[PDB]
């Protein structure tokens, strides 16, 4: 038959084994465990913010699979069975999410913050079997969902590959977002008018692999790091936090460590005196073997008794001081290491405790002067002529940017020509247009989108035969 | 008055397959910040490739399913002084 | 005034620091400790068997000063207030004996076995105060003994010079017997006829010194060892029983050792699983900290913490597993130690339980065989003749021997002649007298006792000066 | 008939001073295993010197107080078959 129903589950981290990924939700109110969306929504700055639900590592079969992790609709901003011409509608929060935080796949983070967010609609077809609906979803696998009201779901602690031990905390989060796996977040509630029908949203993220994990911080760490320098304004606050726990840390260094010092003294004084003990009763045994050696050669004396006997105490006497020996000095060892590895705490506490200086005062050096806004970031450059209010050049059908700006990150506006033959592009830096043969790829002139009058003739350095 | 471009043309020929402006924003910068594109340098001149991670955030102001499966979106972030 | 008497005491060491030894003997009954002699005159084979009663070692001053043990008359064969013509009595048993058994001088010891034993009688003389009387024993200090019916003595423990603590075994003693000490016993009991008259036998023993002591053993030692040569016939039993005890000697050893090598494997394993536990802790702290490194380089992530605490964790964990191969080692040392010593008494052993072999047959092999009685030794000589029935050669007086025999041990008897100029000494080895000139000191000749005839004349080669 | 033979002198003069017999012993050795002397080559055959430790075991046996501070004194052990 079609999707292979399974295991019902009610708002988990559900692998599938990629086949067509069939969904068998388990009806119920939202448990209080999926409930961190309200700790969430908690009015916070302007921002996207999110809370790792679960985690992803490696599973086990060399094939991937996906993890469904569908749940109730609670994060529309408002729902009906509205019209069908809109395939689009918002959400305040969006689950299933490849963050890919400190180092790992976040099988699921809580998006839901001060971001507005739209999203899909698929309505589900019937399907042959009684409550099997397809319901295909743009961009992955078809998928049937099969709603059921008997509440008797999957208990056992998530499937194998996702540990729910997550670092429950509120955090921020980048792009990535559905990148190699989220990519699913759609509203499929759209169920006919008589079925398993309810307000359902269901997001598959791609289980990604150690190394798109790496494929993924990377270029999370690749746009931290561009952000950053364009925001000085902050980011040196950005490095404060770094530098505030980071005292905080060496702190609570210098302090467990004075504790070892503790527990090492502790230890000598103890084990020390312990072994003086033994060097007595040794002493003593041994000076006992001297007060009876006379009787030594005198094999039929009876002292001689004495004597061997004395030899006998002082044999274990000596081993017992040995063992006190061991002791002593391992304790001696510690003892050391320790008192040493305290004054480095105590080094490392001043380097961070001044840095943290180098990076307080430093903040103002940077939050103290004038910065400006957006406004002015808009006058910065000659806004692009709209294609159709470009005049004098016949028709223009806009084309693929392709052509690398020079500064900021986008290409420059290109719109075709003459039949597909003249290209032009805004030149965003003195406002004019710019022309270049098709084929040729080289530069015709400067012409103006008001009325389409060169201004400056074809130049053969410039060029850029760089764009299909 | 900020407003964001949205031109979008076939996977697979190239070709022009259409265009939808975006509300004003008048001075909110936002939009951009949700993104990850700085102002520095990117107001007014640049076309960036809208990728996936960035649709769901887009949406939201396009009366238009962006099909990133059928198709190739790139935004703009235009802004001109008033209406427009 | 006179002998300044002291503290009473009854059958004690007495030190009394030279001076002039004044005794002051507390009357009683023997007391229960110096009875030994009870066990001692024990019916044993014919010899001179003792007890060592008191010890003698390193005492104070650098002054000389001996010890008065008095004590009742308890060793007279049978007494009574005898004829004064008879300054000598016999006596069962002789206290006061300066025997150096092992290494020491015993300050006394039980001198009264299996023969004969005879003593002086000095008759004590009145003096100036009441109860005071001297009783100057030949060979040593006057002394006047004070004997007192109130028993009040000195009970504590014998004057430091003197430790009771001595192998209160029954053993013989050879010449040692007054030498440089002893020589005192004698019956003083003698006190005049109204006074405090009794019984009393005291005898003082000088409190040999360090060197002495071995100016002592020495002897003994030269005479035990000459006798040992005249007495094979016995001395290997001498060397049996010497090599019996050896063996018993070696065995409480092999035992006493693989006691040893038990508690060796015994705080072996012991110590070393104790060890193994340690390792796993610190094993599972290290590899928790890998668990968690991810977060390192991410101070503020919260999974820091729980790196920080692995790095801790392990760091106690390692000190632990220090300590705990502290004690492992230690025991593999003694452990081993153990093992090896332990073969050694296994070798030693062997040696000694075969050596006794070597002394136990070898023992028939000089008892088996037939030797000879006292009445063949009495004809190897010819028998010399006596002074009165020397006939000849005018009269003659014995005088002082001086000439070293040959073979045995004494000197030839010598009489003088010839109103002192004619010197005669008996040659039991072929019977017959020698002369020698005074002066001169050479050979006149050899004579016959019956008559004084000359059977050979003077052989200048033979001669004697080398005798006053 | 084994004898002891006891004769002393002047511990100055070196005069003889006397000497006296010792009842018989017939062949009882024994006198000589209580001084430590051995039988070979010592019975008729030397005068040993009486030294203190000796006196104690050999006065029971002459009727002579040996004054070993005032003389010096030897024995001999001499030993003949039958009486004399």
């Known amino acids: ?468 | 008055g900020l407003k964001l471009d949205l031109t979008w043309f076939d996977k697979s020929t190239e070709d022009f397959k259409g265009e939808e402006y975006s509300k004003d924003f008048g001075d909110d910068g936002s939009v951009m910040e949700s993104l990850g594109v700085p102002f520095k340098d990117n107001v007014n001149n640049g076309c960036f490739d809208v990728i996936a991670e960035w649709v769901p955030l887009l949406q939201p102001y396009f009366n238009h399913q962006i099909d990133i499966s059928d198709n190739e979106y790139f935004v703009s972030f235009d802004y001109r002084d008033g209406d427009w």
């Open chain 1, 1 to 468: 038959v079609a999707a292979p129903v399974a295991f019902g589950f009610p708002a988990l981290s559900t692998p599938g084994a990629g086949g067509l990924a069939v969904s068998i939700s388990a009806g119920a109110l939202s448990a209080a465990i999926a409930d961190i969306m309200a700790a969430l929504k908690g009015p916070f700055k302007f921002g996207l913010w999110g809370v790792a639900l679960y985690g992803v590592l490696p599973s086990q079969i060399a094939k991937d699979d996906p993890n469904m992790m569908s749940k109730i609709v609670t994060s529309l901003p408002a729902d009906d069975i509205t019209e069908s011409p809109v395939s689009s509608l918002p959400l305040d929060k969006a689950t299933v999410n490849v963050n890919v935080r400190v180092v790992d796949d976040v099988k699921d983070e809580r998006q839901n913050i001060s971001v507005v967010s739209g999203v899909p609609m698929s309505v589900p077809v019937v399907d042959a079997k009684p409550t099997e609906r397809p319901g295909v979803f743009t961009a992955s696998i078809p998928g049937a969902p099969v709603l059921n009201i008997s509440v008797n779901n999957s208990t056992p602690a998530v499937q194998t590959l996702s540990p729910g031990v997550t670092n429950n905390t509120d955090k921020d989060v980048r792009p990535a977002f559905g990148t190699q796996g989220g990519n699913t977040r759609d509203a499929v509630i759209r169920f006919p008018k008589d079925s398993g029908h309810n307000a359902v949203y269901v997001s598959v993220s791609d289980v990604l692999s150690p190394d798109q994990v790496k494929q993924r911080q990377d270029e999370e760490n690749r746009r931290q790091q561009e952000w950053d320098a364009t925001h000085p304004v902050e980011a040196a606050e950005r490095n404060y936090e770094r530098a505030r726990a980071e005292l905080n840390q060496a702190n609570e260094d210098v302090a467990r460590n004075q504790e070892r010092q503790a527990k090492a003294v502790q230890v000598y004084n103890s084990r020390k005196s312990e072994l003086d003990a033994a060097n007595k009763t040794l002493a003593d045994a041994i000076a006992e073997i001297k007060q009876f050696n006379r009787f030594a050669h005198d094999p039929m004396a009876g002292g001689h008794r004495m004597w061997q006997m004395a030899g006998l105490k002082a044999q274990r006497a000596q081993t017992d001081v040995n063992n006190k020996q061991a002791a002593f000095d391992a304790a001696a060892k510690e003892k050391s290491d320790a008192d040493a590895a305290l004054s480095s705490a105590m080094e490392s506490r001043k380097k961070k405790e001044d840095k943290k200086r180098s990076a307080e005062n430093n903040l103002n050096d940077e939050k103290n002067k004038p910065r400006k806004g957006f406004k002015d970031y808009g006058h910065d450059y000659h806004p692009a002529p709209k294609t159709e209010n470009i005049k004098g050049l016949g028709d223009l059908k806009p084309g693929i940017p392709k052509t690398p700006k020079q500064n900021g990150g986008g290409k420059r506006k290109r719109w075709t020509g003459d039949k597909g033959r003249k290209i032009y592009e805004w030149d965003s830096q003195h406002g004019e247009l710019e022309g270049y043969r098709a084929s040729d790829g080289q530069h015709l002139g400067s012409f103006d989108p008001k009325t389409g009058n060169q201004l400056k003739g074809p130049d053969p350095k410039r060029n850029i035969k760089k764009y299909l």
